[PDB]
Homo-oligomer: A and B are copies of this chain.
Amino acid sequence: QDSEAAINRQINLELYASYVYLSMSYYFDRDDVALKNFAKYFLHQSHEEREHAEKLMKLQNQRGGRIFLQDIQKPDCDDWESGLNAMECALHLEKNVNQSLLELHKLATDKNDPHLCDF
């Protein structure tokens, strides 16, 4: 039952992902590299991940499990220096949050858990 570690790691990973999505958003918001259509897309994903991270917290208490929170790490930079480097970063970061959601799911498959099969 090492899955509890994967819950709090999935919790802190989406929490981190919205934090990276937030600084990406307000980077394109600076007067200097104004790209309104990108600052809006990244702000929304920031809110989308922050909501999905809380949905998993609620589903944890529904399962009688414990929630341990770690730091939300600093985003790897404050300037992404481009809309195309940040898209590379979000593309790999979106894959990291969805592969880890799949990683934690194959753990609950090998041990049939009717409540951990969701998330």
Tell me the A residues contacting B by CB distance below 8 Å: 19, 22-23, 26, 29-31, 35-38, 43, 48, 50, 54, 57-61, 64, 66-75, 78, 83-84, 87-88, 90-91, 94-95, 98-99, 101-102, 105-106, 109, 117-119
Q: Supply 25 A–B pairs (Cβ within 8 Å), ascending by A.
A: A19-B72, A22-B57, A23-B69, A26-B58, A26-B67, A29-B57, A30-B66, A31-B61, A35-B117, A35-B118, A36-B118, A37-B59, A37-B119, A69-B75, A69-B78, A83-B117, A84-B105, A84-B109, A87-B102, A91-B95, A91-B98, A91-B99, A94-B94, A94-B98, A95-B95
Copies in the complex: 8
